[PDB]
Amino acid sequence: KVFGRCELAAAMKRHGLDNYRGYSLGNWVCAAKFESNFNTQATNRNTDGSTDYGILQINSRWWCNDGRTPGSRNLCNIPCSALLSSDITASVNCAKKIVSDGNGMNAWVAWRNRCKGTDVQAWIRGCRL
Numbered sequence: 001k002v003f004g005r006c007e008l009a010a011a012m013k014r015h016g017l018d019n020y021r022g023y024s025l026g027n028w029v030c031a032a033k034f035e036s037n038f039n040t041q042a043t044n045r046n047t048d049g050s051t052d053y054g055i056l057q058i059n060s061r062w063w064c065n066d067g068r069t070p071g072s073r074n075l076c077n078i079p080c081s082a083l084l085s086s087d088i089t090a091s092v093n094c095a096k097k098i099v100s101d102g103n104g105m106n107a108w109v110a111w112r113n114r115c116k117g118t119d120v121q122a123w124i125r126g127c128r129l
C-alpha cells in the first residue's frame with residue numbers, strides 16, 4: 001500500500017509514535033517519505049547482503065529474519081516480510097525498539113540526512129489529527 005501523507009500520520013499517531021522517545025510525528029512521516037516514499041512494499045538490498053524492508057526500511061542484519069542474511073540477528077522477532085504489510089503495526093512496533101537502541105532516529109540514515117534539523121512539522125501540516 002502507498003499511503004497518503006496525512007493517512008500515514010494518522011496511522012502512526014494511533015500506533016503511539018507521536019513523541020515516542022521525544023520524536024514528534026513529523027519526524028516519523030519525514031523518515032517514511034524518504035525511506036520508502038510511503039510504500040509499505042519497498043525493499044532495497046545493501047552492499048553487505050542485508051535488505052531493508054517496508055515503510056521504514058528496517059534492516060535484516062539486525063531486526064528481522066529474511067532467511068538470507070548470514071550471521072544476522074532478529075531483534076524484533078519477526079519475518080522481514082511482515083514489514084511489507086498494508087498494516088503498519090509490525091513496522092511501528094519494531095521501529096520503537098530501534099529508536100530506543102541508543103542512537104535515537106539517527107539509526108535511519110535518511111532521517112539524519114534529510115529530516116534532522118529541518119521543519120519536520122511541515123510533514124503533518126493540514127492533516128486532521
Ligand code: NA
Pocket residue numbers: 060061062063064065066069072073074
Ligand atoms: Na536477520
